[PDB]
Design a protein around this ligand. Structure first.
Ligand SMILES: Nc1ncnc2c1ncn2[C@@H]1O[C@H](CSCC[C@H](N)C(=O)O)[C@@H](O)[C@H]1O
Ligand SMILES: Nc1ncnc2c1ncn2[C@@H]1O[C@H](CSCC[C@H](N)C(=O)O)[C@@H](O)[C@H]1O
Ligand SMILES: COc1cc2c(cc1O)[C@@H]1Cc3ccc(OC)c(O)c3CN1CC2
Ligand SMILES: COc1cc2c(cc1O)[C@@H]1Cc3ccc(OC)c(O)c3CN1CC2
Lengths: 342, 342
């Protein structure tokens, strides 16, 4: 064996940090403004970065060439040096006409508090009942967000941006919100999901049900009523309930408790609309696989037994909580809408 | 644009932390012990891990399947679930007959002190004269190693393991050490490089020239003599000098100063033997490219202007410091031995 071949595995820790830097330096917007297909030199990019550092372009090229070699940026090698463009992935770091991109999510998932917890992810293998975040920070993630405003904001903005992205794709495929008149969003974040839904379907009365520290941070979105509560104690009586990126935070026992409380709050013809990525039974080097494995490891490090689930497992949760039927609506690259029918 | 495609970029931070966990859980050795071609289930691997956690195998599978999807482990899905085997890269995580692997390097380069500094790598673009590590920790990396023994040890072991790996490959191709009688290793770490050399060439007297805190951490390698000092003030009189993984720690100004002090310490016809990875002039999809870019970003975050260099740049350093001639000896996947002749 030639062990030199292994030293390059250190690239894996370099790459997320290079990406974080490029995000914070506004690289992706700068490239995009030259044209979605544009490729720019380091000097052309630095022209739009506020810096008086004469070495800025050389330094930036060191970051960008690692991203390009790793296929996070497109690259063309010219006689005068490299030029850099966007990929299908990194184009998503550019704000849309509404100011929305994946940037808030990517900055949250490499935030210091998250990364510090990741050093203890092996403890979930070694020790029963240990949550890496709780061990690293002394309390559970949601309590910590309630105590630390900068994490509350980083997290709430990450979820909000992800919500607009998710619902922009949901509405291309799934029409089920059209027939609803009222929707309680259990664990609905700062209300962005409901604002998206009510923007598309303005006849819907939307109730965001959340922890006090989240509703305190929430914008006064038109049509959205914010109510504080604890979903483990109960949820408001509701014609229909939305549960997005909530069940994957919790182990099966807590997920069933949430769903039972939803069952209790719903009428006979009521539905829980679940929005999650779905873990494929067959994992590979593809987007549906990584779109589940990525949040799965974030759940493993951050949350109380949280995990991503297969279709079979979601159906099992629904049935264990009293729902008679599950309907699955694949949206895009693993994201699903699921209806739990009572 | 489907912005869901950008969310998966969070994989970049998950993957190195999964790898670190698998290393700390000894997964690669456990697989190897079953047969260099074995594929083991998470339950079979947990059989060899000290844990009382009945969830251990489920938890371990969550880490390993991310490594498998990323081609760091082979993965096959069978009737009882996934089984995992080694790759060419991950085989380098298994110790050889001498106890050597890349593990010490991979644990050092994802150590908390390093990753903390990486949060400030964008400052090298934005501000002249800023070193991310110094900004994060209040002093330069080598001084910090003198103050924090856990980093001193992790770093010294990483460099030692890398040294044995490097010289195992050097000695297959480069015969220039055979003709030497005296060799001062300037910045020679804990002496592993000299131990390799003087073991292979027992006529050579090896003198390691290092900072006191490194020498204090060194093993009792037979035949290796340590001298403490500061190479910027001068280096010991020497018939020949070794400089391995030193020049890439420093900007051109400080590299030239080191090489000038070497020139002063050498006789006519004395040689500086430089061992470094070499940055290809045109980057491509090859091992030498990634093997230079990875340490280049580590230099950017850790060291005082350190950077990887092309052949042209190394020749320029040699000539600027008074050397008449450079000879280049490619070893393997970008690693070179270079002779600077006076
Ligand atoms: N006990 C509880 N009761 C109500 N909400 C809770 C809760 N514990 C956690 N949560 C909320 O669950 C949310 C999970 S993150 C998902 C937020 C939003 N549904 C979205 O998809 O973007 C957080 O906003 C958190 O505040
Ligand atoms: N001023 C100085 N004088 C002497 N050695 C120094 C020094 N500043 C840094 N060093 C040393 O330079 C080394 C760079 S790391 C490379 C170590 C070794 N040559 C190897 O290849 O494995 C460290 O071990 C550090 O202690
Ligand atoms: C495909 O890529 C991604 C997918 C997903 C997430 C992040 C990704 O990068 C985030 C990460 C995350 C982290 C913590 C949470 O609660 C504390 C949480 O609900 C989520 C939600 N999920 C939704 C799925
Ligand atoms: C191909 O992959 C790698 C190549 C190399 C290194 C690590 C890698 O993963 C290490 C990293 C490193 C970090 C800090 C140093 O001084 C503070 C230092 O000398 C080195 C040496 N280099 C040698 C080249």
């Amino acid at each position: 064996v030639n062990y030199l071949s292994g030293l390059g595995l250190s690239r894996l820790i370099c790459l997320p940090m290079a990406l974080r830097a490029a995000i914070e330096l506004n690289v992706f917007e700068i490239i995009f403004q030259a044209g979605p297909e544009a490729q720019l030199s380091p000097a052309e990019i630095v022209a739009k970065i506020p810096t008086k550092n004469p070495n800025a372009a050389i330094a930036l090229d060191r970051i960008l060439r690692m991203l390009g070699a790793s296929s996070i940026l497109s690259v063309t090698t010219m006689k005068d040096g490299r030029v850099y463009g966007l990929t299908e992935e990194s184009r998503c770091l550019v704000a849309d006409k509404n100011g929305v991109s994946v940037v808030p999510m990517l900055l949250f998932t490499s935030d210091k508090a998250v990364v510090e917890s990741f050093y203890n992810i092996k403890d979930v293998v070694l020790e029963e009942g240990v949550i890496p975040f709780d061990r690293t920070h002394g309390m559970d993630f949601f309590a910590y967000a309630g105590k630390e405003q900068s994490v509350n904001k980083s997290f709430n903005q990450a979820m909000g941006a992800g919500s607009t992205i998710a619902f922009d794709e949901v509405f291309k495929v799934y029409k089920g919100f059209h027939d609803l008149k009222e929707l309680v969003d259990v664990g609905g974040g700062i209300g962005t999901s409901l604002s998206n839904i009510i923007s598309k379907y303005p006849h819907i009365k939307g109730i965001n049900f959340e922890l006090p520290h989240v509703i305190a941070d929430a914008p006064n979105y038109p049509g959205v009523e914010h109510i504080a509560g604890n979903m483990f104690e109960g949820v408001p009586n509701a014609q229909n309930i939305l549960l997005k990126w909530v069940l994957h935070d919790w182990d099966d026992e807590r997920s069933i408790k949430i769903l039972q409380n939803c069952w209790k709050a719903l009428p006979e013809g009521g539905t829980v609309i679940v929005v999650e990525f779905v873990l494929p039974q067959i994992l590979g080097n593809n987007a549906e696989s990584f779109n589940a494995l990525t949040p799965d490891l974030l759940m493993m490090t951050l949350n109380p037994g949280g995990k991503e689930r297969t279709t079979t497992e979601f159906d099992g949760l629904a049935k264990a909580a009293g729902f008679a039927e599950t309907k699955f609506f694949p949206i895009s690259q693993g994201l699903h809408v699921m209806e739990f029918h009572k």
